[PDB]
Amino acid sequence: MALIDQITTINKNEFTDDFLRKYFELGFGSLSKHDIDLLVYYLVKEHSDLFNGKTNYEISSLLTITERKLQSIQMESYLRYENNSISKNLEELSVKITKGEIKPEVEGDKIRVLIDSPVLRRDLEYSITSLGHIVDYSFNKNILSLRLSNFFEVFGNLNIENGKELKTQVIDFFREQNKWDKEILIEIENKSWWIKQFNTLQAAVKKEAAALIFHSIISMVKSHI
Amino acid sequence: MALIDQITTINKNEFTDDFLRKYFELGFGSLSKHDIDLLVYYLVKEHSDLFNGKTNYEISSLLTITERKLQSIQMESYLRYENNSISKNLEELSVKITKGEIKPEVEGDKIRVLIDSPVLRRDLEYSITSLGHIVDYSFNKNILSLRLSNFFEVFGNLNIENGKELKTQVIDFFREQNKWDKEILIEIENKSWWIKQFNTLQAAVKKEAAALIFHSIISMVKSHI
């Protein structure tokens, strides 16, 4: 079975102990098939490394189910059997960016972020839309697209975790890169600035700018509940 | 949970390994609730001592299910996941009699045997009714009642495992006990013999006679496929 030996490590004692406690909570035969499928997904995720570092495409292939079914299973099981703060999920998103597992990229006046985890996607969307203002964004499958000019105009004044204003931290990045790149004016609330001036920069400056921008946006959202 | 700590020993490694192999045989989410309930029953029975030495009443109480449901689950799970010969099940029945876990008792012209296991009950009934003749017997719940006079008249000539005829082995028992009990004629194919003469014996002779008779009947049935 390509499945059970793809498991390279698993705490079999607590897989068994946990399964028995939850299968038998209301008595033998009390859980529905769907309840048990959520339990099994949780048990493999909590007590093995099977899903570790794998994309949704890989996990769905491993489980022999569609990506759409996997997303429902992942969310329903997380809600049933796990508890995380929005703060911890936002921080996990941030760390994935620092590690390069998620690579934000700017195109025109939009920053785009592939977020494969439905749990992280849910908490980001909820938290970023709970700041008192409608947010200019959309999702293309699992890719968040966020309008830059409008975001900084509307939310640029809110503090990030290190106390500085969001717009301040992003502007300060562009100044430093002006030290080794050809100098540009900095107008982050300007749609045409992103479209023409930002587009001029070297692909590696733009890559790094997008990671810092999204790090700072997450940091701003974490600072505000 | 009165359940999971009633487990005094369990191979948790193979409980986990076995569950994963069978849960995932056709892919995640392919097994019905009923399929999974049969699997779990088999897994607890194969990989723990939870059910060991317990009556159906105790197991059903442990599982929070009726005795009728338990019997269906036990049979369906055995058929799905286990394999035993009729010969091995008949021998297990025999050993339970020697151990005193099952105590055959004669009343009138009938010998009665409580058989709690639906698996053993099924193989006994099938094997004992596959000897070419209709058998005079009935079940009261899990108590087999077998008519003595008619059984020895019809099947008394068939060999038991040690080569002797069934009627011969049973008669030889009554002779030995005549050595220390008051002597009786021996007419095991006679209904009124069981009802009046056998009834005379001491309760401990009758207890031992019933175990030897049923041991020999099982031995006869094992000798004939």
Numbering used by the authors:
A (entry chain A), B (entry chain A): 1 to 225
Q: What does the published report state?
A:
The SidN molecule forms a nearly cylindrical shape with a length of ∼60 Å and a diameter of ∼35 Å. The architecture folds into two domains. The smaller N-terminal paw-like domain (SidN1–82) is exclusively α-helical and formed by four helices (α1–α4). Three anti-parallel helices (α5, α10, and α8) are packed against the β-sheet and the rest helices (α6, α7, α9, and η1). The C-terminal domain contacts the paw-like domain via the N-terminus of α6, as well as the loop between β2 and α6. However, the surface of SidN has a hydrophobic concave region lined with conserved residues on the end of the paw-like domain, suggesting that this region may serve as a binding hub. A single-amino acid change of phenylalanine (Phe19) or mutation of both phenylalanine (Phe19) and valine (Val40) in the center of the region to charged polar residues significantly decreased the punctate distribution of SidN at the ER and nuclear envelope, indicating that this conserved hydrophobic patch in the paw-like domain of SidN is essential for subcellular localization.
SidN (Lpg1083) is one of the L. pneumophila T4SS effectors and does not exhibit sequence homology with any functionally annotated proteins. SidN, a hypothetical protein with unknown functions, is translocated into host cells in a Dot/Icm-dependent manner. Our results show that SidN is a nucleus-localized effector, and its structure adopts a novel fold. When ectopically expressed in mammalian cells, SidN is transported by Importin-13 into the nucleus, where it attaches to Lamin-B2 and interferes with structural integrity of the nuclear envelope architecture, leading to nuclear membrane disruption and eventually cell death.
